[PDB]
Amino acid sequence: AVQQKLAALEKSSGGRLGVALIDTADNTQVLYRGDERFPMCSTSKVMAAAAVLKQSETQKQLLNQPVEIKPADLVNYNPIAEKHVNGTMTLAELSAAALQYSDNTAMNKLIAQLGGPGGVTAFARAIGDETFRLDRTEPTLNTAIPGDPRDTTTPRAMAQTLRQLTLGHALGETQRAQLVTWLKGNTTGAASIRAGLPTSWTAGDKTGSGDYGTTNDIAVIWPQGRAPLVLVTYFTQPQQNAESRRDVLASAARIIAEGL
């Protein structure tokens, strides 16, 4: 029923839809193209911010370290960083900017802190994610070209990783709590996964988008009276200039929630 429903949604959408749910009540999963690769776009900002949180476990002042923002550092979406050009932002500020505002300049500083995209990938491998790969910086990591393995993961892998980071033991308890608080404070998510969930429920999420109408969201969800869920919804379309479809992610999440 749920599989058939997600297939129906996909066919009507004209794109390719990827879904992974983990229900932590009983370790049940629901996968739809769970092992196909999709461009992550800004959902990758979670892995970068989490990597810096991991570093902060052994450098308890790391999040207070200032980082210079120069004019030439600004890229294509800098709602927070543009306010600080010719000044500085701390790594905590850059983390919150990247997660909660989806600031691309902030993400670049997180990547640089980790020694480049490969350091983010290395963190993913260290926590048992063999699938995630970050290959580029912002903004080009969002080109989302069909078939391109760069800056991709699978829904199954990303759901597992988001669970380990937010509900498991990938991070220390303080760092886990900080990540959760950041995600729950997201500003960009009301039209995506969370639009398809009951309004009683609480959640944190990280959205992404790019070329090929790519429209993504990953979420940790606390349903009324139930153990938490982790839900990944990835969507991408066959034409480079396709419009975003946050509604399709909301629809997928509604199918999932009604199936619980």
Ligand SMILES: O=C(Nc1cccc(-c2nnn[nH]2)c1)c1cccc(Br)c1
């Ligand atoms: O900045 C965004 N989009 C963006 C920025 C810069 C360039 C383009 C773009 N160029 N060509 N097609 N899209 C899109 C964006 C999209 C969705 C949510 C949030 Br938060 C930010």
Ligand SMILES: O=C(Nc1cccc(-c2nnn[nH]2)c1)c1cccc(Br)c1
């Ligand atoms: O803790 C880490 N790595 C670590 C520690 C012990 C073992 C392993 C490991 N084994 N196989 N792959 N990684 C990794 C680590 C790695 C890269 C970035 C960041 Br941030 C943290």
Ligand SMILES: O=C(Nc1cccc(-c2nnn[nH]2)c1)c1cccc(Br)c1
């Ligand atoms: O040719 C490509 N990339 C590319 C872009 C820019 C320059 C070059 C290049 N320069 N010299 N040889 N190749 C190649 C390409 C083809 C199919 C899928 C994808 Br993703 C990329």
Ligand SMILES: O=C(Nc1cccc(-c2nnn[nH]2)c1)c1cccc(Br)c1
């Ligand atoms: O399995 C997990 N947690 C967990 C905790 C306590 C008990 C069990 C359990 N008991 N029996 N089977 N699993 C699992 C877990 C937590 C975070 C990320 C990922 Br991937 C998996």
Ligand SMILES: O=C(Nc1cccc(-c2nnn[nH]2)c1)c1cccc(Br)c1
């Ligand atoms: O960076 C891009 N967009 C963008 C930037 C910042 C945030 C977001 C975003 N956040 N949440 N959902 N989308 C998207 C983008 C879009 C199309 C082509 C290329 Br190349 C880059």
Ligand SMILES: O=C(Nc1cccc(-c2nnn[nH]2)c1)c1cccc(Br)c1
């Ligand atoms: O991109 C727009 N809006 C918008 C607002 C919030 C989120 C997104 C979005 N999120 N993910 N992909 N697009 C787009 C927009 C609105 C009016 C005119 C023009 Br041109 C562009």
